[model samples]
Target: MEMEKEFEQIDKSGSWAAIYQDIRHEASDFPSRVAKLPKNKNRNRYRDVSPFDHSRIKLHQEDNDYINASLIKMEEAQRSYILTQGPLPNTVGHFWEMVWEQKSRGVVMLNRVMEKGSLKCAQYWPQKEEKEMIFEDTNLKLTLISEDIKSYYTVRQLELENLTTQETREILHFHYTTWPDFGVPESPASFLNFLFKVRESGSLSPEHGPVVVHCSAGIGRSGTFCLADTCLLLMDKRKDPSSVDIKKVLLEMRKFRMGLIQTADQLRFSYLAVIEGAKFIMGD
Candidate 1:
């Protein structure tokens, strides 16, 4: 029932392309606030995978120094997403600890454990065969409930429990397996299908704390997904996809997490996905 008026509106003006260029220009100068954080020196991840100090997520278990995460709240859509780097082997315990404390119901991973024969992210979940993995440092156990592997994506049902409090909750893990490192998906259909699958699960709903989204460094591909999703939500709310200033939305989201929509190609793909998604919602 919705129309593409917004898309048409922006397209007719030809200003949107200029806006995209401006966004890329502004992004180039965006500060890496990570250097100011004392804990940035201790994240145990790659030197380039630091979280911005102003928006970083800090753990409070006393002496826990995991700092590669940020809380991105899209108030316009009532969506709270935790943008984080892929978990490191040493910080796996801290990962679950944040999930528990935040009470989040889902984790959306946009990377593979290994890509191009290089380790992109650590294997942070319990294997289906192992059923569970316990983190002694944080006193938490990650039990695998079920795992459904698709052609390009995998959905794993996981259970997280606090050993100290004996509390437990279900967590959905949606991993998009085929999105290449530093590249966008070949088409929006598959990506949007995977996205809607997550939406249907209700984990991304406002009732949950926040849906954690991550990739290798949690800025490139992770930013792409969040940008597309937020833009779509704006379209739905405004009833005009073109009214959604794609570049402006990216800038607003960057306020929460640095370096969102990393590459020009990623930004281009984001526009493609938003257009395709609008058509999809319009029953096109």
Candidate 2:
């Protein structure tokens, strides 16, 4: 199989650095005027990492329709994902509004709230004691119905209520707590375990809306997760899983958002994860 063969060649040659460089060189830099607007500037977590103007998710707000989030769709793989930066304190309402408007069933959080003494993401969801939290700006309320904690990740069931209308919906929150800011997971086993767990919930399926995914900057870890998941799904559909070009897939993904798979380490980790995940999908 080409997938396994290429992985073997890269691993044996130890040339991941060179290959990752090529991938980075091939990535396109689309314009992001909306993200740079003076009014929308504060909505972004990072100054440079911003969503492209074409692919950025538009909120329902009349005065402001910007959010640091991009909708990435891979029709061949039957995947649609909304990739965004971790919510800033002021943009938490905008985050939930996107979720509500998009009808997203699950939120995949790849970073912790605080990392290395820095605040990575806002405390968007309610704590156990708080039980439920309200977003006045968006007229939304979130109620934590259940919590299931694992060794490296936690799954929470939240009920999202549209306060104005009193309508509600259940949203699954998948938090991978151990993944570092710029590094990969310890192993693909644990990462895939979490990935499949989200899959088993049928959240990533076509029946639901796109799965919302985020990390600190919303490009590195978020991109890795989306790339691996999309490639594995494509593998399952094609008779020859090896025919999938991981590079081409990532290049296409970059058109919708900037600076995906940030570091060469992240790019290399993506290859490893997809190769490891192919085993479970195609059978060893």
Candidate 3:
């Protein structure tokens, strides 16, 4: 009856490889037609990792509605996450426009701005020295109000202002700095601790708009975070936490965004994280 042990047995049996392969096989043919259009070409960071047309987020105020983001809704868990690519230099304004329009309470960034000598994401927010960043195109201004740094993550409080409407809002920026692109965190305990920290902020609740989550291409690490978080929430509500099917949950998530949990190792890590998370939630 212990779900955690069942996951461990799957790992010991070496079935994770087949499980991840099946998920990939099932999602390989999903279409992303709008992302293929010539006009929206430059908006995508990776040509291959475009958001599916149906789940893609459209920017209402801009002349171009495209942004490399998808809204992943897990109604059972009462969570909605906007998973997208790291903002391109030109699209940084559109990024702010999204946060402002979506009314999201926080931006959960899983990758560093630069990783392994490559620019993974543009500096979308203002630096401590810069203090403020204004996007004329989107008529949005961002001011860094405070920065709290931790060993593996940083929590920054920023002020988002709508210059056109003269309205401003507070946004939290949760950045996990140690996670590598296409890699898992150091440990599931540490990862779940950070997840709970974000939860403590109540930013992921349904009262606010969907939380904005992103990494380089918005699929690998970003997908891992959402998958683990959703599974834990579902487990919390179930009379039997072991009944939560990690593979089935991930398959459902991939329907909203493609190529989630990129490597077999990432998939394995997800199961590890979920198992560890269940212990924390149920005091097992």
Candidate 4:
């Protein structure tokens, strides 16, 4: 299939179409690959007491003081959060979301796009990095999500007009930004700043129910962000990750995150990114 060649040729950041092509050619079930991923050592008072684990965990650690400090203003809002990865968020077929963040003063282009997701997107759209959303969850209700999967990033943004307008919602387009193979560390500060902006964008970014993230094999940039996001949330607030080495931290995340990372290049970058971000935010 020509799709296989294009998939191999994919050099774009955060592409799921490549994976879909690779898998579809090899597998028969078109939609069996979608599933939601969980956080490392997820804390749930109810589930902990019982031997059984729920499908998903709602993050609630009131004892921790740092989570309180870091999210002082958004503490109430965090309650609205949920996660969906692995399979999908209550739908079948390909989907695309338009996600944006501010570019850095140091970055040459002054802007870059983040379209992170899995290969299942190939079923509906070709090339261009994403497919249309078969379903979407927002505005305290699950609604229909439709988007044109043709063009590039800009086209995805315009497709938002197609979402159900009866309710207002914050949309989070998944992203999988990373370094080029054997590439030099271009802008460490720039990458972290983009993540920080997404995490703190308040209402602009989607806040409720699962932000699906994956890279080719469902790891790599996906794993990096998953680890970084979890660590960033727990950051210095708990004794858990604070004293652990980077490997241990990774091991912990990988326990539940599963196919958490696809490449060593991405794995190493996750650690470096978080460490550097800590320094930048905590004052080195």
Candidate 5:
């Protein structure tokens, strides 16, 4: 992802006295003019996860948010998940010929098309009937679930019934959502657990790079997660985070994936919500 570098302090003057005086002028902004946090939500408060297509999600779905990637309209006819950019498929059967091939870091995917033109809401989770899959569709290439994955898989969802019983060796959730309640102030423990859950479950096996996350347009949520993960990386490199500029920080994230948090509302999320979320990530 295209991430921006937050500047770290450097000493220009050789003398300690001069350096101390220069520290007073160190770049700092209260964000009184630009960084004000957003107010309470109403209609346009939160973004929708539904597909961007207008004709379909508006008439049928109530949420008018994020839509299923498959249906393209009413609901994605099939469950949608993100895959790598270079090629469409990830299969052991097709490429068993090679011994070792480099798999990309869980090809970060985002789901942004919130119920057509509007961005307020994202229609998460397709309807029950729609979640089922037909073998004829080529996009549903799920992998074998490892023993470790199976344990958490069962814990997260009681019954692994949705995925085909016979076909699913290693279980995979075809769809997932990244919209944790941005409104709630995550507690210290609660927030740490959040990072751990995503870090653990969101990972891909040694065989498959990390997990693939796709919502609708494959740019919004997926991109945000990727961006934050990169931010955590930055926190690792630097000591003082308060000096960092968030827009400049996320702008770097947008470079990797186009149209990430493209609107003002999304920008607010990165500024306010993501900062809250990052504290936990930093703590972890």
Candidate 6:
């Protein structure tokens, strides 16, 4: 596996900053289709947040307001993911609507509802014992089936029902709480365990649509998770756990979703997590 060599280079050269800067500089001119998007329909509270034209997720329904989301498909790795911003108060219904329409089986949330006195995301799902939460705008209902709260994360089993068609599906919600805003996880072990737990449920399989992944802006921690996860899948596919090129993989993923792996720290952590996960896969 060539990953050992890449790891050695990173360890000796301390060049993560350069690689991180290179991706940002390269993507600086990438087209953001915001001009084409109806200004009236943007739900992003921050003007800086907008989906790129090359890989934005288009809603099939004609009448609803568009959400800031993108469908990132990795055909080679047999993994597809919907990367989106944290659900806004008004966009919560649109969020569930996307899930219903896309046939997704899992939602990976890497941030909390409230963090450091700031609200990071809207409380999109229902409470543990509550009968259900209704999204009046999108005509969707999310019922809480069960919830397992772990030390670093929470696994929620929710029943999603399309009120119009009465079509229902069970969705898994994995919320990781250890990640700080604009920073990496303390270690990759806990994150790898969380990722493997998601994999064990088979939600990442091609049979499912795409897992919805998001953080605050849906680009930092979310990108790290997706990038690391995709590299692991590629390693498994090649039957060589250490022959990974993480930078190549991340650049490919960013083509589908803009500004992935936000900070230099995020880029560094992605490499660390991928290497750590490869070791676990190889039983090292």
- Candidate 3 at 82: error in angstroms? 0.6
lDDT per model vs. reference: 0.79, 0.89, 0.87, 0.34, 0.32, 0.82
Candidate that would win on lDDT: 2
Q: In candidate 2, residue 29 scores what lDDT?
A: 82
Model with the higher TM-score, candidate 1 or 5: 1
- lDDT-better candidate, 2 vs 6: 2
**Rank order (by TM-score, best first):** 2, 3, 6, 1, 4, 5
lDDT by residue for model 1 (128-148), tens: 757579899899988998999
Score every model by TM-score. 0.87, 0.96, 0.95, 0.44, 0.40, 0.92
Task: Give model 4's TM-score versus the native structure.
Answer: 0.44
- The TM-score of candidate 2 is 0.96
Q: What's model 5's TM-score?
A: 0.40
Residue 259 alpha-carbon offset, candidate 3, angstroms: 0.8
Error of 3 at 123 (Å): 0.9
144-188: candidate 4 lDDT, tens digit per residue: 233333211111212222244542333434232334434324555
Q: Which portions of model 1 miss their true places by more than 4 Å? A: 1-21, 27-44, 129-131
| lDDT string, candidate 2, 170-258, tens digits | 99999998886545666788888899999999889888899999998999889999999999988889887678998999999998888
Cα error, candidate 2, residue 140 (Å): 0.5
Q: Score residue 181 of candidate 3 by CA lDDT.
A: 53
Q: Write the per-residue lDDT of candidate 3 for residues 1-284, one digit (tens) a residue.
A: 45677677877898878877888887645678989999987798998898888899999864678898999999788889999999998999999999989999999998899888899989888887366899999999999999999998999999999998999999999998888554566678777888888889978987999999998999998998999999988888888777888878888898899888889889889888987787777565
Candidate scoring better on TM-score of 2 and 6: 2
Number of backbone clashes in candidate 4: 17
Instruction: Sort all candidates by lDDT, best to worst.
Output: 2, 3, 6, 1, 4, 5
Q: Candidate 1 or 2, higher lDDT?
A: 2
- TM-score of candidate 1 versus the correct structure, residues matched by position: 0.87
Candidate 4 Cα outliers beyond 4 Å, as residue runs:
1-168, 174-178, 181-187, 203-207, 239-244
